């Protein structure tokens, strides 16, 4: 069930593995949640030079989050005095001439941005980079980082990793379920699309795109968009693991509440704007903006959901005509007519009207005509009801402007423009973002809101790039759940095995002071017909591969001269390595994780190749006739 960490011995392989990908740098490590937490546990606890440099970093971070000025002025005195002025009097400040002065100027003028300390951030980082980083790599905190990294990199999800509950949505090509990831106990949503019910509609593109689109957006944690942490499939379904929203959609709430007041709509608008800002910062127009695609959490806060029809305008701009009818901007509907973010402003405009009045604005007399809802959008200013305030009007005016020349949001600074709408004068957008505003609707506690077909080789190939894990989400999940409590158990377990070896005597590792390239645990195969796989500790040297079991020295080996090929092979569907040996013989090895396999291959190939070009040059060593 729970997450088990690989043994410390795993460090030999992951370190080379990361090193190959440049990922053993201060930059790359410091900026990962678990890397961060391990670095700091090191500096603060086990290294005296480093403690202050990080406390200082941290205090600044708490200072960038201070809400006011009156909160600010205060803390930035203590921060100065404590982490600088103390030092200055003892000559010992390990920072620039400029930096130091740049802060003290903002103090005597009492003009204190949230960035004051930014010249220092850079320099704390220079001060930590390089040399201090080096000792951390040598420390068993980096060994611990390698253990968590190994688990990360070996994720292969299946339905079984999930404890799956009630359905909380039906629609498009499948269903959504509440669920719990067993590892960590995290509640998530699970959106399950039936591959068949897809082919039937040649809908494959859309299914894929959602995945592509989700990945551009699911970084940063946006509170106002439903985001993804894993994707995986089985032969029949695609699965997305998603942010849980079990509160129902507006389309449904609307139908039960009836229409919302300006006040209540202002709340949703604001969260929705902010969601749009996020996506628009990453060049993604959402396009299917509407009550049914806005979701409520348990408390009534909202998220933009379902990015199937959403698309990227980074390199080239769409001109195509997609959306739900009655919420599409002019430039959209018109084919041969390109566009960007703009549609979402219009659609917002459209949508908000709807929350106030029970219908799309261009859907009077409950018509269905699809061609004429389009007409009303082209040359036509919409008449805004007598009951709407002056400020609501100017907003909708701004948002529904036939032309993009003169629509609100499309004049240079996105989002911001609409936030300055005096419809929102009353609001503070930092406080919107922190979800501090009480929502007007609290979902009560549940919501409720054919086959002859086959599946070829070349169907599943469409889905070959589908699975995926988002490092940022996984680390976050772990960091909030089991990381402290596992590091703990692990710590204790390793110190049993080690302190017990202080009795036994397995006490002077065999790799040290030689030319070993790598070592670790693998399972070689004895007799196939007995599922005999004996697990050994292997050491790789530049001209042989030694191995052993518990207690002994190595009794056995294989030389690099003897190895002809190294290949990947399938056995009872786990991946092994196949070393073919000169006597027409074979030698199979199973690794415990992807990266371990990936690495043992690169190194075995490198080593046999070099050793053979080497021996070839040495007259005493080569084979002659």
């Amino acid at each position: 069930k729970k997450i088990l960490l690989p043994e410390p011995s795993i460090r030999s392989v992951m370190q080379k593995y990361l090193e190959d990908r440049g990922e053993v740098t201060f930059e790359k490590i410091f900026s990962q949640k678990l890397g961060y937490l391990l670095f700091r546990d090191f500096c603060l606890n086990h290294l005296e030079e480093a403690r202050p440099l990080v406390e200082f970093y941290e205090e600044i971070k708490k200072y960038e989050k201070l809400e006011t000025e009156e909160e600010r002025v205060a803390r930035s005195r203590e921060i100065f005095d404590s982490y600088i002025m103390k030092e200055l009097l003892a000559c010992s400040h390990p920072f620039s001439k400029s930096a130091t002065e740049h802060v003290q100027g903002h103090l005597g003028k009492k003009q204190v941005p949230p960035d004051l300390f930014q010249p220092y951030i850079e320099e704390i980082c220079q001060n930590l980079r390089g040399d201090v980083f080096q000792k951390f790599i040598e420390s068993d905190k980096f060994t611990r980082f390698c253990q968590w990294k190994n688990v990360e990199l070996n994720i292969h999800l299946t339905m079984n990793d999930f404890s799956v509950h009630r359905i909380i949505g039906r629609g498009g090509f499948g269903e959504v379920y509440g669920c719990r990831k067993a590892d960590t106990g995290k509640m998530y949503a699970m959106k399950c699309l039936d591959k068949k019910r897809i082919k039937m509609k040649q809908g494959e593109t859309l299914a894929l795109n959602e995945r592509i689109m989700l990945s551009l957006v699911s970084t940063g944690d946006c509170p106002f968009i439903v985001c993804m942490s894993y994707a995986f499939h089985t032969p029949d379904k695609l699965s997305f693991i998603l942010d849980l929203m079990n509160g129902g959609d507006l389309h449904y709430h609307l139908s039960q509440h009836g229409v919302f007041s300006e006040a209540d709509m202002r709340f949703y608008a604001a969260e929705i704007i902010l969601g749009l800002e996020h996506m628009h910062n990453r060049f993604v127009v959402y396009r299917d903006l509407k009550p049914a695609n806005i979701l409520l959490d348990e408390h009534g806060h909202v998220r933009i959901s379902d990015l199937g029809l959403a698309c990227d305008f980074s390199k080239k701009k769409p001109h195509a005509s997609v959306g739900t009818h009655g919420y599409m901007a002019p430039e959209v509907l018109q084919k041969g007519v390109a566009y960007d973010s703009s549609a979402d402003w219009f659609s917002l405009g459209c949508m908000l009207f709807k929350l106030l009045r029970g219908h799309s604005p261009f859907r009077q007399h409950k018509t269905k005509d699809k061609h004429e809802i389009d007409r009303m959008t082209l040359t036509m200013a919409v008449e805004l009801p007598d009951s709407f305030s002056p400020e609501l009007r100017s907003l909708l005016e701004g948002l529904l402007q036939r032309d993009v020349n003169r629509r609100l949001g499309c004049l240079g600074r996105g989002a911001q423009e609409v936030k300055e709408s005096p419809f929102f004068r009353s609001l503070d957008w930092q406080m919107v973002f922190l979800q501090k505003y009480p929502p007007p609707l609290i979902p009560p506690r549940e919501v409720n809101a054919t086959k002859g077909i086959k599946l070829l080789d070349s169907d599943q190939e469409l889905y070959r790039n589908f699975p995926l894990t988002i490092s940022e989400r996984w680390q976050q999940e772990v960091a909030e759940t089991v990381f402290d409590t596992i590091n703990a158990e692990t710590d204790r377990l390793e110190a049993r095995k080690k302190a017990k070896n202080k009795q036994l005597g397995h006490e002077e590792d065999y790799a040290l002071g030689k030319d070993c390239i790598m070592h670790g645990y693998m399972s070689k195969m004895g007799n196939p017909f007995l599922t005999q796989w004996q697990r050994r500790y292997f050491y790789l040297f530049p001209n042989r591969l030694e191995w052993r079991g518990e207690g002994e020295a190595p009794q056995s080996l294989l030389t690099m001269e003897e190895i002809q090929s190294v290949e990947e092979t399938q056995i009872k569907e786990r991946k092994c390595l196949l070393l073919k040996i000169r006597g027409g013989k074979q030698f199979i090895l199973q690794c415990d994780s992807d990266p371990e396999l990936v690495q043992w291959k690169k190194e075995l190939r490198d080593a046999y190749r070099e050793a053979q070009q080497l021996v070839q040059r040495v007259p005493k060593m080569k084979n002659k006739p």
Partner: protein, 339 residues
């Protein structure tokens, strides 16, 4: 031109030497020894089989005590064996895996090995607290180490794929004297019993005599059609035998400054890896790539006996100072003992 003229007259000196040599070829050694009785068949059998190395053995050497003997293997270790019981006095893991050669010092207090690390590492067997440190790492060659022999505990001679050999001072670490002349990878050496002279053999298929103290080459022996892999002095120090890729061994006398005898058959096509002389000089022992060691009559050039329990190449061999025994070492990972 002067560059022409010095090549011209090296060519002319070459002739002076060939001629001077033929002027002394008044008889052959075979003629001379036609009379004496043959050796009969030499029949040795495996006494000991030494088991431990996990890969090929590339080299071995005996201690003067005629009992302990050191070996080096592609398993990146040396083992120091007691032949009498088969016990392992020591087992040394090396710092570089690419070892090729080893040696036991006269005293039996130090050993030495090297390889593609390009260093001769001296291992003090007998430490302050019964351990085995590396006492020294003699660095300076610019190519693989191919052979080494102690003169005594404070000096040593090496041979290298950089085509030179060298005299070192162990305490200081210094390359005292170097020995240039060979135009190809030097592959083996042997110290004359009096330690004032050694010979080297090389991939140029010449072999050379050198004076230690003077750092010079006195004499150069051509004749082989191919790489000389192995070389050993006749016990009186007046001659030496070589073994080569041309499937022949040869005996060269120093004072007559030329070859006296080739050892061979049409039935033997592979190269020779190694050579030693029985205690009297009378037998010449050679290890071959066809797995067998051939034992030759040194004086009559006949082929007396064969040592043959080895499933791969015999890569090295040696005879004890007391003459009681012969050790053979193989690519099949074992040493055997023969007597």
């Amino acid at each position: 031109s002067e560059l022409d003229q010095l090549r011209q007259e090296a060519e002319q000196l070459k002739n002076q030497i060939r001629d001077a040599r033929k002027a002394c070829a008044d008889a052959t050694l075979s003629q001379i020894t036609n009379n004496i009785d043959p050796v009969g068949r030499i029949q040795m059998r495996t006494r000991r089989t030494l088991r431990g190395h996990l890969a090929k053995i590339y080299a071995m050497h005996w201690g003067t005590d005629s009992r302990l003997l050191v070996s080096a293997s592609q398993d990146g270790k040396l083992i120091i064996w007691d032949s009498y019981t088969t016990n392992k006095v020591h087992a040394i893991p090396l710092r570089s895996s690419w070892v090729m050669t080893c040696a036991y010092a006269p005293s039996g207090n130090y050993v030495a090995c090297g390889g593609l690390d390009n260093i001769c590492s001296i291992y003090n067997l007998k430490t302050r607290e019964g351990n085995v440190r590396v006492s020294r790492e003699l660095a300076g060659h610019t190519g693989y180490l191919s052979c080494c022999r102690f003169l005594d505990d404070n000096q040593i001679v090496t041979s290298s794929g950089d085509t030179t050999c060298a005299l070192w001072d162990i305490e200081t670490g210094q390359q005292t004297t170097t020995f240039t002349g060979h135009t190809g990878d030097v592959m083996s050496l042997s110290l004359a019993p009096d330690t004032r002279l050694f010979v080297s053999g090389a991939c140029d298929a010449s072999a050379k005599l050198w004076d230690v103290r003077e750092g010079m080459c006195r004499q150069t022996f051509t004749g082989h059609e191919s790489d000389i892999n192995a070389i050993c002095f006749f016990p009186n120090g007046n001659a030496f035998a070589t073994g080569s890729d041309d499937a022949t061994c040869r005996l060269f006398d120093l004072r007559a400054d030329q070859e006296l005898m080739t050892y061979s058959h049409d039935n033997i096509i592979c190269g020779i890896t190694s050579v030693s002389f029985s205690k009297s000089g009378r037998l010449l022992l050679a290890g071959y790539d066809d797995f067998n060691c051939n034992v030759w009559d040194a004086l009559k050039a006949d082929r007396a006996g064969v040592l043959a329990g080895h499933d791969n190449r015999v890569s090295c061999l040696g005879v004890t100072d007391d003459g009681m025994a012969v050790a053979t070492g193989s690519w099949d990972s074992f040493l055997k003992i023969w007597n």
